[PDB]
A paper describes a structure:
The three mutations introduced in region A fail to emulate the contacts identified in MnP4 (left). However, compared with the native VP (middle), they contribute to reinforce the interaction between helices B'b [name] C by increasing the H-bond network in this area, as shown in the [name] [name] (right). Similarly, the two substitutions in region B strengthen the loop between helices H [name] I by interaction of the Arg239 guanidinium group with the Asp237 carboxylate (right), mimicking that observed between Arg245 [name] Asp243 in MnP4 (left). By contrast, the side-chain of Lys301 appears exposed to the solvent. The results revealed that [name] is significantly more stable than native VP at acidic [name] neutral pH.
[name] (VP, EC 1.11.1.16) constitutes the third family of ligninolytic peroxidases, which was described 20-years ago. VP combines catalytic properties of the above two families due to the presence of both a Mn-oxidation site [name] a catalytic tryptophan in its molecular [name]. In the present work, VP (isoenzyme VPL2) [name] [name] has been subjected to protein engineering using a rational design strategy.
Residue numbers in the entry: 2 to 327
The structure:
């Protein structure tokens, strides 16, 4: 404990500080909650969800890097191969497995985010053994049942799915509508805030680029894109309530995202042959901005889809509602 004099609870985890320091400088652009962080977060999902107790797949096993030429040609993995190519030199350079690195980079990346949380992290996943099977990654044009069943088959309850999707608060899309790459799922792609759950709950006005790409629904806001799957999920009897539940109190968004991610990172892996290295993850900057309806239009535009509970709705800020920049 440890070399720099930096510090953790179990010693096999000091291997992670050169990795951490390297990541922050050269992967994440001096550590910032931007594209490389978003794509790193997305990669933890596309690697780990590659798991089915019956259909096969090693889960959180680094397979999407180890067998990149195979998995990155899965149609559902469109746009992933660039972050794979981004991380490979760091995997090559260092002495942790591909699986560990993918999940480590995701954790670190989130902690960079304003409003972020620190996902627990474990060390010791073996090299991948085999490519994930195709057709295990939920696609944005899939039905709510299909998606709830895929995630469920991997072990998540429909409510765990809404929690994980808080990820989309720090998230954009390059491939859904190619003519508008880097267009986010909410107004604040740099901030881990509830804006995503709110803005997906507004009426859909327009298509931010070319109309009706597969998997795309109409957006409420120019400069923001909406997935068909987030739209359905927000309004479906099965997930509508918990979806609304997530409207401003970053607390539950932070608690639940942290713990379900921790759960996602262990798919196909076994926690008690791993060491806790969660202490290594950096402290995240506090939330800037309040969760607001994007002004201009009212609760007139919130499609309540939960009967049991009404809106948890703070009012909006002044006059118009302004741009959100891709
Ligand atoms: C459950 C069904 C899900 C569907 C249908 C879905 C769909 C998508 C799609 C279509 C994109 C845009 C990719 C692109 O065109 O550039 C995206 C981005 C993203 N996803 Fe999801 N996703 C799901 C779940 C998740 C989960 C569980 C996570 C947890 C980590 C996650 C994290 C992210 C992140 C961080 C991005 C940002 C990509 C970027 O900024 O480049 N998603 N998702
Ligand atoms: Ca995998
Ligand atoms: Ca956000
Ligand atoms: Mg599908
Ligand atoms: Mg991207």
């Amino acid at each position: 404990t440890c070399d720099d004099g930096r510090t953790t609870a179990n010693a096999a985890c000091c291997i992670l500080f050169p990795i951490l320091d390297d990541i922050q400088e050269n992967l994440f652009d001096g550590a910032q909650c931007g594209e490389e962080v978003h794509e790193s977060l997305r990669l933890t999902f596309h690697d780990a969800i590659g798991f089915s107790p019956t259909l096969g797949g090693g889960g959180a096993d680094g397979s999407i890097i180890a067998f990149s030429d195979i998995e990155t040609n899965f149609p559902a993995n469109a746009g992933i191969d660039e972050i794979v190519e981004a991380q490979k030199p760091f995997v090559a350079k260092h002495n942790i497995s591909a699986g560990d690195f993918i999940q480590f980079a995701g954790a670190v990346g989130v902690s960079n985010c304003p409003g972020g949380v620190r996902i627990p992290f474990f060390l010791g996943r073996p090299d991948a053994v085999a490519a994930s099977p195709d057709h295990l990654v939920p696609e944005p044009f899939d039905s709510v049942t299909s998606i709830l069943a895929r995630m469920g088959d991997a072990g998540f309850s429909p409510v765990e799915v809404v929690w994980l999707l808080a990820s989309h608060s720090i998230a954009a899309a390059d491939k859904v509508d190619p003519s508008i790459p880097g267009t986010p799922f909410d107004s604040t792609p740099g901030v881990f805030d509830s804006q995503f759950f709110i803005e997906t709950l507004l009426k859909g006005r327009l298509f931010p680029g070319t109309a009706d790409n597969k998997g795309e629904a109409q957006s409420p806001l120019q400069g923001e894109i909406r997935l068909q799957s987030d739209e359905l999920l927000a309004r479906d009897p099965r997930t509508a309530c918990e979806w609304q539940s997530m409207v401003n109190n970053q607390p539950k968004i932070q608690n639940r995202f942290a713990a379900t991610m921790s759960k996602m990172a262990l798919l196909g892996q076994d926690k008690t042959k791993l060491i806790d290295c969660s202490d290594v993850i950096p402290t995240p900057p506090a939330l800037v901005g309040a969760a607001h309806l994007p002004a201009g239009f009212s609760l007139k535009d919130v499609e309540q889809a939960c009967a049991a509970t009404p809106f948890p709705a703070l009012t909006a800020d002044p006059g118009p509602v302004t741009s959100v920049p891709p």
